[PDB]
Structures are given as C-alpha cells and as structure tokens.
C-alpha cells in the first residue's frame, strides 16, 4: 500500500488523507472508500492513517 500525494489538516498528529484517485476501486488496505459513480468509477480513500504512506512512484535519487 502507498500514497503519492497526501494533504494534512491543523493537528499534530496531522490528519493526512491520501488524495490519490484510482479507477474502479481503492487498494486493499483502505478501510473507507468512496467513488464518483461514473463508469469506470473514480475512487478515493477517505481513511485517516498517517503521516502520509509510502510513495507509489519509485524513488530515483541514488545512482549519481
């Protein structure tokens, strides 16, 4: 499970939702998932876990 793109509200622990949109459904880890009911659905996790998850897109900053 990952998140490229969180955003956080004025607390600390900062309440960070993941903003990532996935078509059709959310990844298995998400515990509350909403969708804009087009077809294919446009789906978001509204969970509050983190602190932001793992980025999805690999790192790219070690070779040089």
């Amino acid at each position: 499970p990952c998140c490229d793109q969180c955003a956080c509200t004025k607390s600390n622990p900062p309440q960070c939702r993941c903003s990532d949109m996935r078509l059709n459904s959310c990844h298995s880890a998400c515990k509350s998932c909403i969708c804009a009911l087009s077809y294919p659905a446009q789906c978001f996790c509204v969970d509050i876990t983190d602190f932001c998850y793992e980025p999805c897109k690999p790192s790219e900053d070690d070779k040089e």
Binding site: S25, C26, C33, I34, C35, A36, L37, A41
Partner: peptide, 9 residues
Amino acid sequence: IVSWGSSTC
C-alpha cells in the same frame, strides 16, 4: 445530480 458515494454502493 448523481455525484459520488460508497465504493460498494
């Protein structure tokens, strides 16, 4: 206008 809801309806 139908907008969003439960990922599982």
